[PDB]
Amino acid sequence: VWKDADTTLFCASDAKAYETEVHNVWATHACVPTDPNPQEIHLENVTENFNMWKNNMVEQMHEDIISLWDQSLQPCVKLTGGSVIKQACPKISFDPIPIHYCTPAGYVILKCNDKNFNGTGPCKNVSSVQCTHGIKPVVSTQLLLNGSLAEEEIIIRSENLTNNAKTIIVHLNKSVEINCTRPSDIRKAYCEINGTKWNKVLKQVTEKLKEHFNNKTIIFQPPSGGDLEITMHTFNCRGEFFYCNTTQLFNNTCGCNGTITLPCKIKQIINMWQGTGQAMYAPPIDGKINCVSNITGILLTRDGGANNTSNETFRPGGGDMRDNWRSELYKYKVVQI
């Protein structure tokens, strides 16, 4: 009694209308207040098919996050091509907030509750919703932060495991904490990670990929070329862009179960993930910067040519932030009634 049809969604959130936080301020006038009585109703004995890769819900989320960042973050010198802008860049307050996506009249969001759903194929436990759930728009590379965990075992999401061009999204079932600090060289910082927890999870991820890869041996080597943005766990902490060398995490060696410390730097000059170009920001806040986050997902790529070798090699990746969003909109699909 329905049909697949992509249209314009709208958004909702608990954005505090008094907070100056840029996500709050932008959500105070680009989104409607939250659904007071959310009503998730189940669809008895139904089966509909999902494809988290050919989902237009991301393409819409992408545009919003682009708008949020374009309105909010103030660079001292925005640059493009055949143009150079030189505005101001004061001290802000950054901290993502959950925003809910919603469907207008005549349409509805279908949700996939199969716990072991890989993102693609038929879904047996389908329930409809008027809006999604709170989704923090967190921008990052290699690791996915402050995300939603799985409800069973690790999941391997890829549009096509056969193609090495396609990225691999590893959905963890156990969040691993990351703790990054710049104490009172002002651009030097470090991230602390529990080696024990991590190596175990990584060992779990190893066997999970063996299953999908004919028991071949796997190796986690570091990135193979690219910009500093892509070869470093790039993210944002309280406004300041952090660049973290994850070489310790991606090794096949792991007395290596204490506290893994990763060296980081706060960069003022970055390569925008919108593609636009490069941008420069002010020094950091006069004090002690600190963010504690949950490692939820992992973003990997695989090298080709190994159809006659024994083992398989994966490197942490990213770049396209659509995968960051698609890591949250995988279970949703928009249908018109």
Ligand SMILES: CS(=O)(=O)N1CCC[C@H](C(=O)Nc2ccc(Cl)c(F)c2)C1
């Ligand atoms: C055009 S691009 O998509 O190939 N590519 C260009 C180079 C780097 C870009 C990027 O990832 N920037 C980026 C910036 C800030 C943060 Cl906090 C982050 F996590 C990432 C992506």
Ligand SMILES: *[C@@H]1O[C@H](CO)[C@@H](O)[C@H](O)[C@H]1NC(C)=O
């Ligand atoms: C369907 O999903 C719901 C919500 O996640 C959960 O209670 C359970 O996994 C399933 N319930 C039934 C009756 O199949």
Ligand SMILES: *[C@@H]1O[C@H](CO)[C@@H](O)[C@H](O)[C@H]1NC(C)=O
């Ligand atoms: C996901 O499940 C479908 C079956 O519904 C299967 O064809 C596909 O290969 C699976 N993909 C991965 C990455 O496991």
Ligand SMILES: *[C@@H]1O[C@H](CO)[C@@H](O)[C@H](O)[C@H]1NC(C)=O
């Ligand atoms: C981190 O994960 C724990 C459970 O694993 C959860 O209770 C907590 O809210 C998460 N924190 C964030 C910031 O997502």
Ligand SMILES: *[C@@H]1O[C@H](CO)[C@@H](O)[C@H](O)[C@H]1NC(C)=O
């Ligand atoms: C996570 O998944 C692995 C297999 O992928 C499983 O062995 C493990 O028990 C799971 N852990 C949790 C906390 O669900």
Ligand SMILES: *[C@@H]1O[C@H](CO)[C@@H](O)[C@H](O)[C@H]1NC(C)=O
């Ligand atoms: C997966 O990728 C391979 C290699 O690029 C390609 O030849 C094949 O057609 C793809 N398979 C599917 C099912 O899309």
Ligand SMILES: *[C@@H]1O[C@H](CO)[C@@H](O)[C@H](O)[C@H]1NC(C)=O
């Ligand atoms: C994070 O690390 C800082 C310094 O490395 C430490 O003072 C703080 O207690 C840590 N916080 C958590 C939640 O682990």
Ligand SMILES: *[C@@H]1O[C@H](CO)[C@@H](O)[C@H](O)[C@H]1NC(C)=O
């Ligand atoms: C690592 O996690 C274990 C539990 O798996 C916990 O007992 C310990 O405090 C953690 N150690 C570090 C160094 O984070």
Ligand SMILES: *[C@@H]1O[C@H](CO)[C@@H](O)[C@H](O)[C@H]1NC(C)=O
């Ligand atoms: C992988 O090896 C296990 C035994 O270690 C075997 O039971 C299973 O059939 C193999 N699977 C694949 C896909 O090769």
Ligand SMILES: *[C@@H]1O[C@H](CO)[C@@H](O)[C@H](O)[C@H]1NC(C)=O
């Ligand atoms: C990360 O550190 C390792 C040594 O710990 C070094 O070999 C590597 O070049 C560093 N990564 C980058 C992107 O410079």
Ligand SMILES: *[C@@H]1O[C@H](CO)[C@@H](O)[C@H](O)[C@H]1NC(C)=O
């Ligand atoms: C993740 O959430 C925690 C708690 O809400 C926050 O302290 C931290 O800054 C967040 N990390 C990122 C990268 O947004």
